[PDB]
Amino acid sequence: TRLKIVTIHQEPFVYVKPTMSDGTCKEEFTVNGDPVKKVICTGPNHTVPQCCYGFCIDLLIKLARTMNFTYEVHLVADGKFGTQERVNNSNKKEWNGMMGELLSGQADMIVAPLTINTERAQYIEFSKPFKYQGLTILVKKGTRITGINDPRLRNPSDKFIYATVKQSSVDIYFRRQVELSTMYRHMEKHNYESAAEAIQAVRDNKLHAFIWDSAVLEFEASQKCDLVTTGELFFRSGFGIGMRKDSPWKQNVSLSILKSHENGFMEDLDKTWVRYQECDS
C-alpha cells in the first residue's frame, strides 16, 4: 500500500548522505534549532540505503501526513530528471530519468524539483507548482556575461565553454528552438551527468557557464562566494509533483500545495533551506 516515491540528488531540495556505520542517519538541526527530518532513500552510491533530507523531503513528509499515505523513497536509477528518446537503436521512444520510472511503475509519485512543461504534461500529470522559478546562468566570480543573449553564447567558440545537464528539461528547452540551434549544438558536446558535477566544473574553471534552474543556482551561488549568477531569469518555470495520468492523488496533492502557499509553510521552507546564511562553502 506504500507509495513508491522517486527523487533525485539536488541541493537544497534533496541532500543525499551516507548512513552512519550503524545504519541510522546523523542527528542534525536546522537554522531554527529543530531536528532535520531525515528519510531513508535507497539508490546508487552499487545501490544502498542512504539518508535524504531537504526542501522536498520536508514537503513529502507534509504531503504524506495531510493525505494519510505511507511511502518508501528511492533515488532515480539513472540519475536523470527525464527526456524522451529513441531506445535500443530503434524508433521506439521511451522516457528516461524520473519521468521514465513514473511511467513504468517503478515509482508512483515524483517528489523533487521537477520542472513542469508541455512535453512532460503530454505523458504525466503535475500538481500546481510548489515553487515558482526559472532559468539562469552560473559563472565563476569575475566572468563577464550579459545573459542568455551574450555573444559568447550566441556565437559559440571553444574559448568559452557552456553547458547544462544531460536528459533534463533544460537541454530540451534549447533543443526545441531553431534560433538556439547553434547553442544546442555547442552544449551537446559538453553537457554534464548531474548539476553537482557541472557546478564543480565551473568552480574548477573547467566549465565557463552552467545553464540551469535558478532555484538551484541562486542557492549554490549564495553559499559559495566564488560563484555568481547573471541574476536574470530568461525563462520562467515552476516545479511540481509528478503523477501518472488519472492518478487518485492529483486533486489532493494540489490541495495540499495550495494550503502550503496560503499558510506560510512554503515560505518557512525557504527560510529553512534556501535563504538563511551568508556564503562560506
Three-state SS letters, 164-209: CECCCHHHHHHHCCCCCHHHHHHHCCCCECCHHHHHHHHHCCCCCE
Does 152 count as an annotated binding residue?
A: no
In degrees and rounded to multiples of 5, residue 221 shows phi and psi of -65, -30
Contacts with 225 (C-beta within 8 Å, 6 or more apart), sequence order? 141, 279, 280
Residue 251: which of 128, 108, 132, 129 has the closest Cα? 128
Contacts with 103 (C-beta within 8 Å, 6 or more apart), sequence order? 94, 95, 123, 124, 244
Residue 107: which of 124, 132, 90 has the closest Cα? 124
The C-alpha cell 546564511 sits at 277
Q: Quick one: 273 exposed, middle or buried, by C-beta within 10 A (0-12, 13-18, 19+)?
A: buried
Does 237 count as an annotated binding residue?
A: no
Does 256 count as an annotated binding residue?
A: no
Domain ranges (residues) in the chain: 1-132+241-281, 133-240
Out of 3.40.50.960, 3.40.190.10, 3.40.630.10, 3.40.640.10, which CATH number does the structure's domain 1-132+241-281 have? 3.40.190.10
Does 115 count as an annotated binding residue?
A: yes
- CA-based radius of gyration for the chain: 19
1-132+241-281 and 133-240, same CATH topology: yes
211-237 burial by CB neighbour count: b if 16+ within 10 A, else e? bbbbbbbbbbbbbbeebbbbeebeeeb
The C-alpha cell 531537504 sits at 54
Instruction: Name the amino acid, one letter, at 100.
Output: G
Name the fold adopted by 133-240: D-Maltodextrin-Binding Protein; domain 2 (3.40.190)
Cis peptide before 12 (omega within 30 of 0): yes
Instruction: Name the amino acid, one letter, at 6.
Output: V
Q: Quick one: 55 exposed, middle or buried, by C-beta within 10 A (0-12, 13-18, 19+)?
A: buried
Does 120 count as an annotated binding residue?
A: yes
Q: What is the dihedral of CA 127, 13, 147, 119, to 10 degrees?
A: -30
Q: Is 254 helix (H, G, I), strand (E, B) or coil?
A: helix
Please, which residues bridge with residue 187 across strands? none
In terms of DSSP H, where are the helices of the chain? 55-66, 97-104, 118-121, 151-154, 169-175, 181-187, 195-203, 214-223, 250-262, 265-273
Give dist(CA 266, CA 204) in Å, integer: 34
